[PDB]
C-alpha cells in the first residue's frame, strides 16, 4: 500500500527550540528513525543557516531536492541524505533543511514536501 512518494507538511522548528537534536548514532539508524518519524507525523525540519549544524547532533539527516519539474500542490519532491564526519550517504539536490524529531515544539512555518519513500 506504500506509495513511492508521500505528501507531507513538516513543521519548521527554530534550532534553539529543538529538544531532541538528532535521530540516533549511526547513518543507518538516523535514516531509519527519520523515515519512521516522517511516517508517524513526528518529524520536524530545521532550516540550515550558519551556526545551525554545530547545534545539532551527528549523524545528520537532510532532506534534499530530488527534481526540478514536479511540485504538485506546493510539495517539492525530496529525498533523504545522511551526513557523518563530512561524508554523505546519498547524492541529491539542494538542502531544504535538517530533520529532527518533533516532540511538540511550536513551529514557525510548515514546509510542504513530496517525500520519496
Ligand X SMILES: OCCNCc1ccccc1
Q: Which is nearer to ligand X, 20 or 52 (CB)?
A: 20
**Nearest distance from residue 74's CB to ligand X, in Å?**
27
Q: Say what the alpha-carbon torsion angle 76, 58, 13, 67 is, to the nearest 10 degrees.
A: -10
**Nearest distance from residue 20's CB to ligand X, in Å?**
5
Q: Which is nearer to ligand X, 59 or 101 (CB)?
A: 101
Q: Which residues bind ligand X (CB under 6 A)?
A: 20, 101, 103
Residue 32: burial class (beta carbons within 10 Å; 0-12, 13-18, 19+): middle
Question: How many whole angstroms from its chain centre is CA 65?
Answer: 11
**Nearest distance from residue 103's CB to ligand X, in Å?**
5
Amino acid at each position: 500500500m506504500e506509495k513511492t512518494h508521500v505528501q507531507l507538511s513538516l513543521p519548521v522548528l527554530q534550532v534553539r527550540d529543538v529538544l531532541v537534536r538528532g535521530f540516533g548514532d549511526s547513518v543507518e539508524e538516523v535514516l531509519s528513525e527519520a523515515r519512521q518519524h516522517l511516517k508517524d507525523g513526528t518529524c520536524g525540519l530545521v532550516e540550515v543557516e550558519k551556526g545551525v549544524l554545530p547545534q545539532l547532533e551527528q549523524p545528520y539527516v537532510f532532506i534534499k531536492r530530488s527534481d526540478a519539474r514536479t511540485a504538485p500542490h506546493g510539495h517539492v519532491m525530496v529525498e533523504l541524505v545522511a551526513e557523518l564526519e563530512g561524508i554523505q550517504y546519498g547524492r541529491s539536490g539542494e538542502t531544504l533543511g535538517v530533520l529532527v524529531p518533533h516532540v511538540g515544539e511550536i513551529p514557525v512555518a510548515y514546509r510542504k514536501v513530496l517525500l520519496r519513500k
